[PDB]
Amino acid sequence: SKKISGGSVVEMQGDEMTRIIWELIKEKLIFPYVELDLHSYDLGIENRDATNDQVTKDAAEAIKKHNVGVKCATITPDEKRVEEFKLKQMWKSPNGTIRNILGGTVFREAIICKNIPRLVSGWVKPIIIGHHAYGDQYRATDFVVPGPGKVEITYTPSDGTQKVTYLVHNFEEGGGVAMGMYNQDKSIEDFAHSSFQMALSKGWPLYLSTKNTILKKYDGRFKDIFQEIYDKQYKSQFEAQKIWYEHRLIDDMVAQAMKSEGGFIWACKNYDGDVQSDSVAQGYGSLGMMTSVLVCPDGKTVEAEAAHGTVTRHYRMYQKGQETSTNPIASIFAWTRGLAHRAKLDNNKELAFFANALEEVSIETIEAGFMTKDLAACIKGLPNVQRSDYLNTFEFMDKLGENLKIKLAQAKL
Amino acid sequence: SKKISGGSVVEMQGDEMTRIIWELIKEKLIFPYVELDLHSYDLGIENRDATNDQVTKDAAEAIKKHNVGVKCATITPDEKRVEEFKLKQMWKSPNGTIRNILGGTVFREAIICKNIPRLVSGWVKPIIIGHHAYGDQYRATDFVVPGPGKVEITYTPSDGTQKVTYLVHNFEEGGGVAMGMYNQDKSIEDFAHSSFQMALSKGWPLYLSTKNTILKKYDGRFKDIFQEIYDKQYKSQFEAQKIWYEHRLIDDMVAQAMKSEGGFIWACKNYDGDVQSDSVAQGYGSLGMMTSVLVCPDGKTVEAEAAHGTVTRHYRMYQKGQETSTNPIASIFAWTRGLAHRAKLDNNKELAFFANALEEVSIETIEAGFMTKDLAACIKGLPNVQRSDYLNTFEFMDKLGENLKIKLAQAKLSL
Numbered sequence: 001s002k003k004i005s006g007g008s009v010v011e012m013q014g015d016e017m018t019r020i021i022w023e024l025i026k027e028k029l030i031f032p033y034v035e036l037d038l039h040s041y042d043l044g045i046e047n048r049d050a051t052n053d054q055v056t057k058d059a060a061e062a063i064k065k066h067n068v069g070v071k072c073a074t075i076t077p078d079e080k081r082v083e084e085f086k087l088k089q090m091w092k093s094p095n096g097t098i099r100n101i102l103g104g105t106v107f108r109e110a111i112i113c114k115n116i117p118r119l120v121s122g123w124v125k126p127i128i129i130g131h132h133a134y135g136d137q138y139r140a141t142d143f144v145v146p147g148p149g150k151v152e153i154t155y156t157p158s159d160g161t162q163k164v165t166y167l168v169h170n171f172e173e174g175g176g177v178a179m180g181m182y183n184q185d186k187s188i189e190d191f192a193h194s195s196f197q198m199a200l201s202k203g204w205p206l207y208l209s210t211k212n213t214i215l216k217k218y219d220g221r222f223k224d225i226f227q228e229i230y231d232k233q234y235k236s237q238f239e240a241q242k243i244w245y246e247h248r249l250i251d252d253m254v255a256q257a258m259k260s261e262g263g264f265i266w267a268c269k270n271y272d273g274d275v276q277s278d279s280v281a282q283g284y285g286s287l288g289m290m291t292s293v294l295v296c297p298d299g300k301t302v303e304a305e306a307a308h309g310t311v312t313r314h315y316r317m318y319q320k321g322q323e324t325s326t327n328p329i330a331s332i333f334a335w336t337r338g339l340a341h342r343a344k345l346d347n348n349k350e351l352a353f354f355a356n357a358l359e360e361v362s363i364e365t366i367e368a369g370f371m372t373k374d375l376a377a378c379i380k381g382l383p384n385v386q387r388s389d390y391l392n393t394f395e396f397m398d399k400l401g402e403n404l405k406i407k408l409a410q411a412k413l
Numbered sequence: 414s415k416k417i418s419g420g421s422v423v424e425m426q427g428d429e430m431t432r433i434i435w436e437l438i439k440e441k442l443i444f445p446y447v448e449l450d451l452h453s454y455d456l457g458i459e460n461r462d463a464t465n466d467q468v469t470k471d472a473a474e475a476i477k478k479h480n481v482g483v484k485c486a487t488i489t490p491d492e493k494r495v496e497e498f499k500l501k502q503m504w505k506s507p508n509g510t511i512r513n514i515l516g517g518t519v520f521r522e523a524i525i526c527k528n529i530p531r532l533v534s535g536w537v538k539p540i541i542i543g544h545h546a547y548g549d550q551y552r553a554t555d556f557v558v559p560g561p562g563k564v565e566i567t568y569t570p571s572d573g574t575q576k577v578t579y580l581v582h583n584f585e586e587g588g589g590v591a592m593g594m595y596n597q598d599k600s601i602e603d604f605a606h607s608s609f610q611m612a613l614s615k616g617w618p619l620y621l622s623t624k625n626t627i628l629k630k631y632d633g634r635f636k637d638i639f640q641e642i643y644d645k646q647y648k649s650q651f652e653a654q655k656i657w658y659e660h661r662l663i664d665d666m667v668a669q670a671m672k673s674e675g676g677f678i679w680a681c682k683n684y685d686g687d688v689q690s691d692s693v694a695q696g697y698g699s700l701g702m703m704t705s706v707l708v709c710p711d712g713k714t715v716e717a718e719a720a721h722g723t724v725t726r727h728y729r730m731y732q733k734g735q736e737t738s739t740n741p742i743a744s745i746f747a748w749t750r751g752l753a754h755r756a757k758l759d760n761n762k763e764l765a766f767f768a769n770a771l772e773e774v775s776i777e778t779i780e781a782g783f784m785t786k787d788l789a790a791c792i793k794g795l796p797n798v799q800r801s802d803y804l805n806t807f808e809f810m811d812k813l814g815e816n817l818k819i820k821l822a823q824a825k826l827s828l
């Protein structure tokens with residue numbers, strides 16, 4: 001039938017294997033059924049170098065303008081990759097630039113298929129982890145104490161008066177290490193607002209984990225800010241949807257997440273959520289099933305992408321003309337989450353139906369027995385997987401396109 | 414008939430339900446078969462308040478003297494229990510005093526029973542977690558920044574050399590929080606030595622998790638100290654037992670433990686291991702299956718105990734004469750680990766055999782379907798647990814005693 005009017009969507013192309021999969025997704029799953037007003041920005045390392053990383057800021061401002069962006073996995077430069085593509089500078093992570101310009105919080109969620117076993121058996125519903133990516137250990141000032149001496153940390157108000165001196169330690173036996181770290185009230189407030197809005201959107205309870213029994217001033221501030229914002233702006237909206245917010249001790253938090261069935265938002269400090277990420281990805285199965293959504297404190301602008309990288313090994317294989325089996329679920333769901341938020345903003349029933357139908361097609365295709373090699377490894381175990389247990393990248397994309405056409409034709413019966 | 418010669422052992426008596434189970438373990442499992450030279454010390458809160466915590470120092474020094482101590486779970490006073498017992502001072506945790514006097518490191522391990530389900534699928538062997546319980550967030554100065562201003566951190570050498578001032582942050586809009594924390598070289602060195610000695614004692618590889626990709630100076634110190642001590646004093650000893658040591662990112666370490674099957678020593682910083690403890694005990698099953706061993710850097714002195722507490726709720730039920738189902742496996746294994754180290758130091762063949770036999774009897778008794786209520790809930794799920802699925806405390810202790818007598822009598826019967 002007719003194409004669904006999508007609206008303004010900021011698209012950002014990426015690098016390598018995820019870029020090939022991105023083109024496949026656009027050609028076979030989106031454009032045949034959706035007419036979009038695309039604002040494309042090639043965030044590949046090639047075009048990010050030729051523009052001195054201006055295209056990244058342009059795409060971030062386009063997201064600020066149009067409230068919804070979908071992003072392909074991009075190469076983050078390091079020492080070896082500057083020599084690989086012969087770059088000028090070692091440009092910063094595009095994800096970090098977009099995160100700073102937008103000022104939101106990233107939430108990771110695993111896509112569940114009933115036939116894909118999980119390392120934590122009881123997990124039935126997703127555990128959406130929101131990660132405060134500012135300050136703490138990641139903006140700290142650490143140094144080696146080489147000998148006996150005094151380590152103090154001081155606070156001096158801007159007008160110069162009434163300095164407060166906190167004696168950290170007095171080394172009289174050899175040396176050791178010391179460090180000071182900080183965090184901002186504004187960043188914590190943005191983090192709390194994003195977490196509350198994410199919980200209200202997903203319709204799930206919200207938990208914040210700290211160690212305020214030990215760090216009574218430091219983590220107590222996180223607890224206080226979350227509680228103030230909750231009681232003043234979100235309590236009634238939570239109780240209406242029969243959800244709730246609670247502060248938890250990080251010990252209790254990881255324990256209860258270990259023995260729960262899932263289905264909640266978990267707001268973590270920088271170190272905690274960063275330590276998680278990989279582990280939750282492992283516990284749910286494959287990285288190709290993990291999506292990320294950057295939500296802003298206003299709850300209006302959303303930037304969706306896959307939580308995995310560009311899958312460099314599979315691209316290295318694909319360059320030689322070898323058979324690859326790369327999971328596209330996370331990128332497809334980046335597209336579907338972007339389109340679903342677009343439909344919510346535009347009051348678009350057809351686009352909402354299409355995005356949900358694409359998610360259902362993906363999950364049903366996997367649950368019926370068609371999957372890539374990583375999910376087949378989750379089922380059978382890596383050494384026991386054979387070529388007949390999975391489809392390759394292009395075979396799986398073809399199957400998804402077939403089933404999507406079938407379901408959207410049944411949207412006319 | 415004749416008992417086994419056990420040697421010198423420092424015993425520390427405890428509080429409440431673990432004290433009851435402690436007396437039961439001594440009466441039914443240890444004393445009938447082993448004659449010990451027991452240096453006993455009552456670490457009950459009553460006696461501890463009567464002597465102003467001096468019995469704790471005495472017991473720690475006795476452990477330092479005799480190299481082996483077995484400890485019952487003790488009450489760490491707080492706001493409530495000072496009023497409960499009419500305490501003079503709010504006495505410090507006995508575990509902390511003993512640890513600081515001995516200068517060792519605590520290693521926690523869960524006891525596996527093949528019929529007890531685990532929350533992580535592939536877990537077959539135990540993951541022994543070593544906790545560096547000093548410094549970092551647990552000895553930090555944290556504070557609220559009420560408004561704009563500088564937060565700096567300075568190092569002032571005591572010899573007289575130049576000060577060093579680093580900028581932590583400059584608050585220009587609003588305020589926030591700040592904190593300073595530290596660690597010490599000798600503490601990290603003792604931590605490393607205890608971890609290496611523990612790995613050599615268990616015959617398992619050792620992994621040290623840090624975040625030195627972010628804190629290149631702070632955690633890099635841990636990495637460098639561990640590597641220096643390993644290369645200088647334990648490389649060939651590790652290679653002989655076909656084991657290894659490795660540094661790991663905390664991310665990769667948690668994920669590896671996720672998809673691992675177990676069988677390695679995991680040395681953690683304060684925050685890491687402290688956060689892990691409860692979740693690890695939950696993932697392997699019940700808390701009553703969790704043991705801890707205090708291992709000193711010299712590798713000579715060892716102090717075993719249960720990882721759980723005095724189980725206060727079960728003790729309240731016991732006081733009112735109600736039926737309880739407390740798991741004694743952790744305290745039994747405290748005794749068996751103490752006796753195993755005793756037999757290792759004294760080359761005591763028979764005592765080592767007895768300790769291993771008691772551990773085997775415990776594991777086999779549970780695997781035969783005779784368990785306390787917590788393991789029964791691990792199998793069936795707490796709501797689906799009926800009275801016929803488990804035994805109470807004294808029934809379980811009596812069954813253990815019967816099976817132990819049978820095993821030792823058949824060991825003599827063989828020859």
Ligand SMILES: NC(=O)C1=CN([C@@H]2O[C@H](COP(=O)(O)OP(=O)(O)OC[C@H]3O[C@@H](n4cnc5c(N)ncnc54)[C@H](OP(=O)(O)O)[C@@H]3O)[C@@H](O)[C@H]2O)C=CC1
Binds near residue numbers: 095305314
């Ligand atoms: N969102 C972003 O823009 C991000 C980008 N990156 C960038 O990506 C690049 C590659 O990073 P890398 O370390 O390889 O990590 P990746 O996440 O790209 O992949 C690492 C491994 O995970 C498995 N894997 C990940 N995604 C998939 C998938 N969709 N389907 C199947 N298997 C998958 C593969 O395992 P196996 O080898 O067993 O097949 C792969 O080798 C780097 O330049 C990095 O900077 C990294 C993180 C986030």
Ligand SMILES: NC(=O)C1=CN([C@@H]2O[C@H](COP(=O)(O)OP(=O)(O)OC[C@H]3O[C@@H](n4cnc5c(N)ncnc54)[C@H](OP(=O)(O)O)[C@@H]3O)[C@@H](O)[C@H]2O)C=CC1
Binds near residue numbers: 485
């Ligand atoms: N090693 C030591 O000396 C330690 C001592 N303590 C002290 O112990 C006291 C009580 O501590 P608490 O908070 O109750 O923690 P506990 O570890 O004593 O027990 C808490 C709960 O865990 C379960 N549990 C623990 N051990 C067993 C066991 N052997 N068999 C069956 N279930 C068990 C019970 O759950 P349920 O109610 O569901 O049956 C119990 O109610 C406090 O005064 C504390 O300071 C605390 C920690 C360590």
Ligand SMILES: C[C@@H](Nc1nc(N[C@H](C)C2CC2)nc(-c2cccc(C(F)(F)F)n2)n1)C1CC1
Binds near residue numbers: 689
């Ligand atoms: C996903 C998983 N999370 C989790 N698990 C564990 N240990 C379990 C026993 C192993 C991994 C299997 N340890 C941490 C962990 C470790 C260090 C620091 C932090 C902090 F920084 F976040 F505080 N967290 N995290 C939940 C338990 C399912």
